[PDB]
């Protein structure tokens, strides 16, 4: 109730402000969906922690570890070894260094299918591409061979840092990005 009154206050002061609010109960989301100037298409958003909580554990009933797989992608953390960690703890902790990032695919991906673009990201760029924003626009997760990469397609990647995913924006094919150690991709198709 207190948080809804704050969004009502912020929107009353100026309707166009992007408000992102944290909510504790799913039935309370209905109240702010009904405010005259709440608009999800413009950015307004409600992080309902009851919805999200029960959603992660429900998907774990179908894939037995997803809630940990997935809840680690949405906190920034950097992998930092310590020599007393067991093998499983080093393997686990390397994985916790991952997050999900958005980046534009370079023009070198144009007219590939999503399967070629994903093989290319994984094998050459060491990036896990998992989705694309298809042009109004719509998200597609793991789309099949029917879907082509269009120019300025935004993709969703799992990677260790935003400095990794830039490689997909700078990847310039036979023109310049020819060489096989990933640290070297850093400049355009000059």
């Amino acid at each position: 109730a207190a948080n809804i009154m704050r969004v009502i206050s912020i929107k009353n002061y100026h309707s166009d402000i992007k408000v992102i609010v944290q909510l504790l109960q799913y039935h309370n989301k209905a109240y702010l969906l009904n405010i005259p100037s709440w608009d999800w298409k413009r950015g307004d958003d409600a992080v309902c922690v009851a919805e999200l909580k029960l959603g992660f554990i429900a998907q774990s009933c179908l894939a037995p570890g997803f809630s940990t797989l997935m809840a680690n992608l949405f906190t920034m953390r950097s992998y930092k070894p310590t020599p007393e960690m067991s093998q499983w703890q080093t393997d686990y902790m390397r994985g916790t260094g991952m997050e999900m990032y958005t980046e534009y695919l370079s023009s070198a991906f144009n007219a590939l299918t999503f399967p070629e673009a994903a093989e290319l990201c994984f094998s050459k760029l060491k990036l896990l591409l998992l989705a694309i924003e298809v042009r109004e626009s719509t998200l597609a997760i793991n789309p099949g061979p029917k879907v082509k990469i269009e120019n300025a397609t935004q993709g969703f990647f799992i990677a260790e840092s935003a400095e990794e995913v830039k490689r997909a924006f700078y990847y310039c094919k036979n023109c310049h990005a020819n060489v096989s150690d990933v640290r070297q991709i850093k400049k355009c198709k000059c």
């Binding site: 992102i20 944290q22 989301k29 209905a30 969906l33 009904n34 958003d45 992080v47 922690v49 919805e51 999200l52 909580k53 959603g55 992660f56 554990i57 429900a58 998907q59 774990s60 009933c61 179908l62 894939a63 037995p64 570890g65 997803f66 809630s67 940990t68 797989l69 997935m70 809840a71 680690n72 992608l73 949405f74 906190t75 920034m76 953390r77 499983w88 703890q89 393997d91 686990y92 902790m93 390397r94 994985g95 916790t96 991952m98 999900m100 990032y101 958005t102 399967p115 994903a118 093989e119 994984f122 060491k126 998992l130 998200l139 997760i141 793991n142 099949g144 935004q154 969703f156 799992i158």
Partner: protein
């Protein structure tokens, strides 16, 4: 005891207070200065707590689409139209559906598959995660995102999750693979 066992029933518990994760498991080596995500019950997917969801706020600011990606996965496909319909207070309306709306039943989902048997089992005998990834993407359109591996490589049934392994990462025949899939 379920004599026709017991510590092998799969379980996930939601904690009101994260530091209580230490009581949740034995053979564990607890330490109160470790934060939740490093503890064995969370690494095994046996525990969850709302504190790991705090950083969703900043992801809604930096890339709102990423928050819609996770919401479409975790809700199993709840669109803003369904949130709109629920906000009318009539409850969830439904019935028989037209082929044109029923077309949306081919949604991508996160499934889990085993390297123990079937066509991927060739990678379980000392293959590497990169070989598996490329093969499954090409033959099945399966997009592999991680592993679920036994902690005791010899004892207990506890498994831990490895997100996005390196291309050269060695597989075991007992591993399970997380996959984005259409069927």
């Amino acid at each position: 005891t379920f004599d026709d066992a017991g510590a092998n029933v799969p379980l996930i518990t939601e904690l009101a207070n994260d530091s209580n994760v230490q009581f949740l498991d034995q053979d564990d080596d607890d330490d109160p200065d470790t934060e939740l995500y490093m503890t064995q019950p969370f690494a095994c997917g046996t525990a969850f707590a709302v504190s790991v969801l705090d950083s969703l706020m900043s992801t809604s600011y930096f890339n709102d689409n990423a928050l819609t990606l996770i919401r479409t996965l975790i809700t199993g496909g709840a669109t803003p139209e369904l949130e709109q319909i629920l906000a009318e207070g009539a409850g969830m309306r439904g019935g028989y559906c037209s082929p044109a709306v029923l077309a949306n039943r081919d949604r991508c989902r996160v499934a889990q598959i085993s390297l123990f048997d079937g066509p991927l089992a060739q990678f379980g005998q000392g293959g590497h995660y990169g070989e598996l990834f490329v093969y499954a993407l090409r033959h099945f359109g399966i997009l592999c995102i991680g592993l679920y591996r036994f902690r005791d490589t010899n004892p207990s049934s506890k498994r831990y999750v490895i997100t996005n392994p390196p291309e050269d990462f060695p597989l075991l025949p007992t591993d399970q693979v997380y996959v984005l899939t259409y069927k």
